[PDB]
Design a protein around this ligand. Structure first.
Ligand SMILES: *[C@@H]1O[C@H](CO)[C@@H](O[C@@H]2O[C@H](CO)[C@@H](O)[C@H](O)[C@H]2NC(C)=O)[C@H](O)[C@H]1NC(C)=O
Ligand SMILES: *[C@@H]1O[C@H](CO)[C@@H](O[C@@H]2O[C@H](CO)[C@@H](O)[C@H](O)[C@H]2NC(C)=O)[C@H](O)[C@H]1NC(C)=O
Ligand SMILES: *[C@@H]1O[C@H](CO)[C@@H](O[C@@H]2O[C@H](CO)[C@@H](O)[C@H](O)[C@H]2NC(C)=O)[C@H](O)[C@H]1NC(C)=O
Ligand SMILES: *[C@@H]1O[C@H](CO)[C@@H](O[C@@H]2O[C@H](CO)[C@@H](O)[C@H](O)[C@H]2NC(C)=O)[C@H](O)[C@H]1NC(C)=O
Ligand SMILES: *[C@@H]1O[C@H](CO)[C@@H](O[C@@H]2O[C@H](CO)[C@@H](O)[C@H](O)[C@H]2NC(C)=O)[C@H](O)[C@H]1NC(C)=O
Ligand code: NAG
Ligand code: NAG
Ligand code: NAG
Ligand code: NAG
Lengths: 188, 316, 122, 225
């Protein structure tokens, strides 16, 4: 419904409406529930959980091993819970938040970065749990500086109108939003 | 009886910024975003013109609340309004003089349609004649009150300083003078004399502007070729950069010159469409005392007729 | 826009692709969350799934309107579309031909007048 | 009818007070100017974060990363790309100022003619027959309160353009000849008040065989004794 919103940048802002062109989870999409094989790692994976069942994660096509507190691949780094895995630019990013799917709105604060640059195509967990797309959002911030609402700009045309005006209330009227053009099918 | 031609509105357009500069070039879409927002300005200006044209037509014509109708017994004390009042045997609601007037006068280009169609404009101007004839000037300040026509015309003479015993003793002479002067309007408009000169220069200056905006799509501006795609299939991508950057910086200035000179031209239509809104209120809906504003002489009454993007008065 | 076949020499024609524009008619978000979408002149055969197909497909001179119901009313205009078509929210969105005003007629005759009797200060 | 006119004027001012103390926002013409100026300034502000083909949108890192042999090539693109945005802003402000001056000249004309005297121009100082007006101020604007005069409660009669008495026509001084069916009266043209047709409110011209639609009656003479 509305889950999986994080902080794409380490820059503080306050009381603004900043749009972000980054990889996110779309809204109202179908996630696979599992009441456990090696699932494919497309470009980034959402993950939640329920006491003391879920231990870790096996990654890799050098295969990456996280337990919970690390195994290499060549480097070791020993340091309702939601997680976001991303393989960006030869780094590795994990985001996190835990609260007491529910239907609220809670942001996800960053946890760790890893400068490794490894090869991953599919992933597996180490023993309920729940299992990203190029999008564009419209993040609303507050006084202290936390995200309180966001709008996916490609779900329905009302959201596209709200993303064009950069506002969350649209008064009565008619609005131009986009353009369309059919594509060439084959070569001749 | 004289004639006076004014312009009211002009052609609504809107030009897409992206496809004009580089249609179907996914790396030029990355080259244009290095220029920030020069395309959301140009669409916001050309939208502000297009709504503004649909406000000019509203305040010239839509000034009565009701829609009055002429009675089926057209017996007006000696006069004959059959040239200007509509007759339903035609395929439109349009009258006889207005049919003489409707004959005398893509790379991103789209033309929006008007809001009030020509069969809605032609119903406003049939309400303004039907109230002026049957109710005097009483329908400008409230609700219409009927009055005989030769008693209406008797104290439109009493405004310009001629006592009302002149018209009742000369009623049939004026009716023959009034009916004769209408016919010479219908001759001198349907002849080879081209009187719609002011409305024609609105339309011609909107075609010289678009014959030039398209003509600039064949100038190389210092590049190797004018065709966008043939530069792409003849160069390396790190050396196709500085050839498209002469076309994008070139073709922005041809949009930027077009939009500005449309904004200055659109401002002298409001100066003309606010004058026609005044002559609709003061010449038609009442008798005027301003010298040589409604006609040339002492003023009696007026009758509006429509035209393509304009209005035509008949100052008696 | 016309070019000979180089191999078999039949004369064939060129005309470009669709290239319209989109518009999103909407009431206030503090009233509803239902929109009606207008495309710019594409004749309704060349088209998000409820706002792409289904019923409520209507052909205007302004374009192809999908998501509002054509009625036989005539009301004061609320949201302009073009060519005398206006849309409003009265519960769903309807589209119609706009009206100019109330029909009226005046009892004209060669011997009658209507003097007023009272007034109003506005 | 002084008391009735007084209470109608007081009730009208009260209804204007209510229609403005409510949250009906009718100051759209005063609000659009502020919105257009603020939006033009915000666009001019956000033009500084564009790079226009260079390596960075900030001048300082270009100066600190390059040397005056090949830093000037980077600086020139930014200079041209910022001059064009300034020139566009200044040209559109010069276009908006003419619209504001046209509205100010119309407001000066209304202040001279509606407030400092009574107008005869139709639908200039309000839709109706005009009496007076009252200026009020506003942020960057002016508001008028036009006091018009609208007739109401009409009623049919039967009219005639003259009176033949003894082979002479008789036309009114100012008024129409009306009738309730039996008698004939002269009355003013905007408020029904009949009077007795004497030689104090008519005049005479010619003989009564030329007028089309004349009606017999009898003219009273005010010199009775
Ligand atoms: C008003 O003028 C029109 C045209 O000038 C008159 O219509 C003509 O009437 C004669 C009858 O004597 C016919 O022979 C013509 O064919 C008519 N012409 C047209 C174009 O209709 C009309 O009769 C005049 N009005 C009155 C009341 O006489
Ligand atoms: C003055 O007389 C005329 C004619 O008798 C009245 O007009 C008619 O009014 C009735 C009632 O509304 C309508 O049904 C008719 O259609 C009217 N006649 C025409 C030709 O339209 C008029 O109402 C009278 N004025 C007043 C104030 O009663
Ligand atoms: C003109 O209209 C006014 C209403 O605007 C009439 O005033 C009413 O008069 C009656 C009779 O005394 C009172 O009962 C009402 O209370 C009055 N109305 C108001 C709002 O106070 C006035 O009578 C009308 N003129 C004529 C000649 O009838
Ligand atoms: C038309 O108006 C006249 C003027 O008031 C009316 O004549 C008077 O009518 C009243 C009754 O309402 C009588 O008491 C008066 O004596 C009449 N005046 C004279 C001089 O006789 C007349 O009645 C009205 N017409 C109709 C049909 O009522
Ligand atoms: C209007 O009044 C005149 C003056 O009385 C009328 O003219 C006379 O009418 C009588 C009645 O038939 C005749 O006997 C006289 O011969 C007329 N006099 C002249 C000089 O012709 C006239 O008829 C009246 N009009 C109407 C329509 O009643
Ligand atoms: C910011 O935090 C403080 C303390 O946690 C809280 O009292 C305040 O309400 C917060 N501000 C907002 C806008 O929520
Ligand atoms: C386009 O619209 C016309 C009606 O104006 C219709 O006859 C025609 O079939 C439409 N085109 C297609 C492909 O349906
Ligand atoms: C409008 O009128 C037509 C008459 O041809 C009718 O077929 C149609 O059903 C009417 N529309 C509605 C919504 O009833
Ligand atoms: C008014 O017109 C009718 C026919 O329309 C006619 O019979 C009548 O005589 C006319 N009345 C006058 C006073 O001319």
């Amino acid at each position: 419904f509305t889950r999986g919103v994080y902080y794409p940048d380490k820059v503080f802002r306050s009381s603004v409406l900043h749009s972000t062109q980054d990889l996110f989870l779309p809204f109202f999409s179908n996630v696979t529930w599992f009441h456990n094989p090696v699932l494919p790692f497309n470009d980034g994976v959402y993950f939640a959980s329920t006491s003391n069942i879920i231990r870790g994660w096996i990654f890799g096509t050098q295969s990456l091993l996280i337990v919970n507190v690390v195994i290499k691949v060549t480097f070791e780094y020993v340091s309702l819970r939601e997680f976001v895995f991303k393989n960006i630019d030869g780094y590795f990013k994990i985001y996190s938040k835990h609260t007491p799917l529910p239907q609220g709105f809670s942001a996800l604060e960053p946890l760790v970065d890893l400068p490794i640059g490894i090869n991953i195509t599919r992933f597996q967990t180490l023993l309920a749990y729940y299992v990203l797309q190029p999008r564009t959002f419209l993040l609303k911030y507050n006084e202290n500086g936390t995200i309180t609402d966001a709008v996916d700009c490609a779900l329905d045309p009302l959201s596209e109108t709200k993303c064009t005006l950069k506002s969350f209330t649209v008064e009565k009227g008619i609005y131009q939003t986009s353009n369309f053009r059919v594509q060439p099918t084959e070569s001749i | 009886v004289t004639t006076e031609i004014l312009p009211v509105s002009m052609t609504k357009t809107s030009v897409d910024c992206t496809m004009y500069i580089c249609g179907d070039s996914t790396e030029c879409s990355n080259l244009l975003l290095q220029y920030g927002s020069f395309c959301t300005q140009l669409n916001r200006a050309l939208t502000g013109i297009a709504v503004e044209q649909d406000k000019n037509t509203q305040e010239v014509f839509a000034q009565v609340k009701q829609i009055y109708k002429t009675p089926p017994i057209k017996d007006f004390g000696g006069f004959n309004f059959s040239q200007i009042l509509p007759d339903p045997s035609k395929p439109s609601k349009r009258s006889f003089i207005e049919d003489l007037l409707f004959n005398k006068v893509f790379n991103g280009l789209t033309v929006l349609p008007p809001l009030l169609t020509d069969e809605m404009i032609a119903q406003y101007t049939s309400a303004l004649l039907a109230g002026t004839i049957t109710s005097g000037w009483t329908f400008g300040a409230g609700a219409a009150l009927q009055i005989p026509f030769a008693m209406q015309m008797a104290y439109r003479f009493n405004g310009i300083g001629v006592t009302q015993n002149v018209l009742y003793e000369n009623q049939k002479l004026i009716a023959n003078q009034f009916n004769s002067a209408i016919g010479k309007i219908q001759d001198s408009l349907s002849s080879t004399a081209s009187a719609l000169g002011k409305l024609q220069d609105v339309v011609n200056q909107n075609a010289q502007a678009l014959n030039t905006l398209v003509k600039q799509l064949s100038s190389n501006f210092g590049a190797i070729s004018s065709v966008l795609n043939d530069i792409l299939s003849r160069l390396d991508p790190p050396e196709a950069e500085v050839q498209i950057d002469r076309l994008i910086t070139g073709r922005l200035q041809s949009l930027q010159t077009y939009v500005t000179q449309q904004l200055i031209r659109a401002a002298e239509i409001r100066a003309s469409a606010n004058l026609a809104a005044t002559k609709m209120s003061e010449c038609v809906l009442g008798q005027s005392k301003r010298v040589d504003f409604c006609g040339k002489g002492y003023h009696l009454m007026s009758f509006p007729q429509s035209a393509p993007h304009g209005v035509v008065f008949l100052h008696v | 826009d016309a070019v000979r076949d180089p191999q078999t020499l039949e004369i064939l024609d060129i005309t470009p692709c669709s290239f319209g524009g989109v518009s999103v008619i909407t009431p206030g978000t503090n009233t509803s969350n239902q929109v009606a979408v207008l495309y710019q002149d594409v004749n309704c055969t060349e088209v998000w799934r409820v706002y792409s197909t289904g019923s409520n497909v209507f052909q205007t001179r302004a374009g192809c309107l999908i998501g509002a119901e054509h009625v036989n009313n005539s009301y004061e205009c609320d949201i302009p579309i073009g060519a005398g078509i206006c849309a409003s929210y009265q519960q769903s969105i309807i589209a119609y031909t706009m009206s100019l005003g109330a029909e009226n007629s005046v009892a004209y005759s060669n011997n009658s007048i209507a003097i007023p009797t009272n007034f109003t200060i506005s | 009818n002084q008391k009735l006119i007084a209470n109608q004027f007081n009730s009208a001012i009260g209804k204007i007070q209510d229609s403005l103390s409510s949250t009906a926002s009718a100051l759209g013409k005063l609000q659009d100017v502020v919105n257009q100026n603020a939006q033009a300034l915000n666009t001019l502000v956000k033009q500084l974060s564009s790079n226009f083909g260079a390596i960075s949108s900030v001048l300082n890192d270009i100066l600190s990363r390059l040397d005056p042999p090949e830093a000037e090539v980077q600086i020139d693109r930014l200079i041209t790309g910022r001059l064009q945005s300034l020139q566009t802003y200044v040209t559109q402000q010069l276009i908006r100022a003419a619209e504001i001056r046209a509205s100010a000249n119309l407001a000066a004309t209304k202040m001279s003619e509606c407030v400092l005297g009574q107008s005869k121009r139709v639908d200039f100082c309000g839709k109706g027959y005009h009496l007076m007006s009252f200026p009020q101020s506003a942020p960057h604007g002016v508001v008028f309160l036009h006091v018009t005069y609208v007739p109401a409660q009409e009623k049919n009669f039967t009219t005639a353009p003259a009176i033949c008495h003894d082979g002479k026509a008789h036309f009114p001084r100012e008024g129409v000849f009306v009738s309730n069916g039996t008698h004939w009266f002269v009355t003013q043209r905007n408020f029904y008040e009949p009077q007795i047709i004497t030689t104090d409110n008519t005049f005479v011209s010619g003989n009564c065989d030329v007028v089309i639609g004349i009606v017999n009656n009898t003219v009273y003479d005010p010199l009775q004794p």
